[PDB]
């Protein structure tokens, strides 16, 4: 069973990729009921570059075809307490994102769920929380509110709401 993302223009199947990391922003000003909220990064290309886990492909919110960590998910930040610094998540096992050529790119739901579960586990240990909530982008240009990527010289845009709306106890 898949998480089937709508994308525009339709990416061709040759633009399918491996998801190797992602980049997050922690919601600011939260009273925190033992709860921490994260969204795809509200930062720009510089936030992405500073993670230093990208490969050749230029992409937002998700790193495509980048470097993997060796044994476990690794989360990094230049200052965990600063909500204006993004959080760099590097996967240890990639998540395939397969594009149909007809306007969607699909991800295995069970694999994505298990990846988030691992990311939540590392965040929880960083922030000493219990409940980790992923929520969608709170706004931005099309490149940053969507999962965006340059494939073959053309820019494609996938709504990522389905990837960041879940709770993890």
């Amino acid at each position, epitope marked *: 069973d898949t998480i089937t993302l709508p994308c525009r223009p339709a990416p061709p199947p040759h633009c399918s990729s491996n998801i190797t990391g992602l980049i997050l922003t922690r919601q600011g000003g939260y009273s925190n009921a033992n709860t921490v909220i994260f969204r795809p990064s509200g930062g720009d290309w510089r936030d992405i570059a500073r993670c230093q886990i990208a490969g050749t492909v230029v992409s937002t919110q998700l790193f495509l075809n980048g470097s993997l960590a060796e044994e476990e998910v690794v989360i990094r930040s230049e200052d965990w307490r600063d909500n204006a610094k993004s959080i760099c998540v590097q996967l240890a096992t990639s998540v395939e994102i397969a594009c149909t050529g007809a306007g969607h790119c699909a991800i295995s739901r069970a694999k994505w769920a298990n990846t988030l579960k691992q990311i939540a586990s590392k965040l929880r240990e960083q922030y000493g929380a219990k409940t980790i909530i992923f929520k969608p982008s709170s706004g931005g*240009d099309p490149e940053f*509110v969507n999962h965006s990527f340059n494939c073959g010289g053309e820019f494609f845009y996938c709504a990522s709401t389905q990837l960041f709306a879940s709770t993890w106890f």
Partner: antibody, heavy 120, light 103 residues
Framework: QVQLVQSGAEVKKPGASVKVSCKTS????????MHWMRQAPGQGLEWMGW????????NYAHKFQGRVTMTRDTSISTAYMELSRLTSDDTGVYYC?????????????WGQGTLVTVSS | IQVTQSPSSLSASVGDRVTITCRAS??????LAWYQQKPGKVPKLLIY???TLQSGVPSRFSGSGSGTDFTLTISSLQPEDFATYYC?????FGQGTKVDIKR
């Protein structure tokens, strides 16, 4: 020199929305983050959120998440804050202020403030 | 991060020394700033990094502290210093301290 200039005072009925502008100059607009703060009359300062001017991504204070919208127009080096579903609790002075990019601490230059009055 | 700023108000005379403190609910390195605000005026940055004066701020102002406890010190109050002071720790502002004139 560095100059943040905000739009004039606003008067609103409850349930309305307000949009305040912050026009900047004297610096490279995309090199710094922009934050919004407000101050209810006689009360303290509170942070509303920041906006990344290069890409427009935002991080709103949880308290305002869902009814504030921050945007910018880089071509005129201007930031905007729109607050919706206003109630009299939103009466106060609203400030834009500049920080270094990817920082929340040093708000070195501020707008002059915009009074927003929400009343029937 | 939670912040408790003390005292909410104090009164003092021109020339004497006043101390304003800001406590954080966890260690914050020196990620703190102090601002001054006078009635009807815009907040003004005085100190950031907990102890770095902003350029042109007079020498009577200093900040110190690390971890969770931070202090703004005005070594000898001038008349222009009677005003409200706020600490800022990441996105949290302190409750404010108003400095009144003793008479």
């Amino acid at each position: 020199q560095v100059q943040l200039v905000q739009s004039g005072a606003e008067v609103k009925k409850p349930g309305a929305s307000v949009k305040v502008s912050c026009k900047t100059s004297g610096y490279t607009f995309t090199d710094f983050y922009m934050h919004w703060m407000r101050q209810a009359p006689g009360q303290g300062l509170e942070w509303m959120g920041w906006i990344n001017p290069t890409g427009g991504g935002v991080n709103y204070a949880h308290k305002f998440q869902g009814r504030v919208t921050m945007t910018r127009d880089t071509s005129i080096s201007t930031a905007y804050m729109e607050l919706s579903r206003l109630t009299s609790d939103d009466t106060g002075v609203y400030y834009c202020a500049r920080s270094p990019a990817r920082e929340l601490l040093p708000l070195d230059y501020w707008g002059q403030g915009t009074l927003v009055t929400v009343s029937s | 991060i939670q912040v408790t700023q003390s005292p909410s108000s104090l009164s003092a005379s021109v020339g004497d020394r006043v101390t304003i403190t800001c406590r954080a609910s966890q260690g914050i390195s020196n990620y703190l700033a102090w601002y001054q605000q006078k009635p009807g005026k815009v907040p003004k940055l005085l100190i950031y990094g907990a102890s770095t004066l902003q350029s042109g701020v007079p020498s009577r102002f200093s900040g110190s502290g690390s971890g969770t406890d931070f202090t703004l010190t005005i070594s000898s109050l001038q008349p222009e210093d009677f005003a409200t002071y706020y600490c800022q720790i990441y996105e949290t502002f302190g409750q404010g301290t108003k400095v009144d004139i003793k008479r």
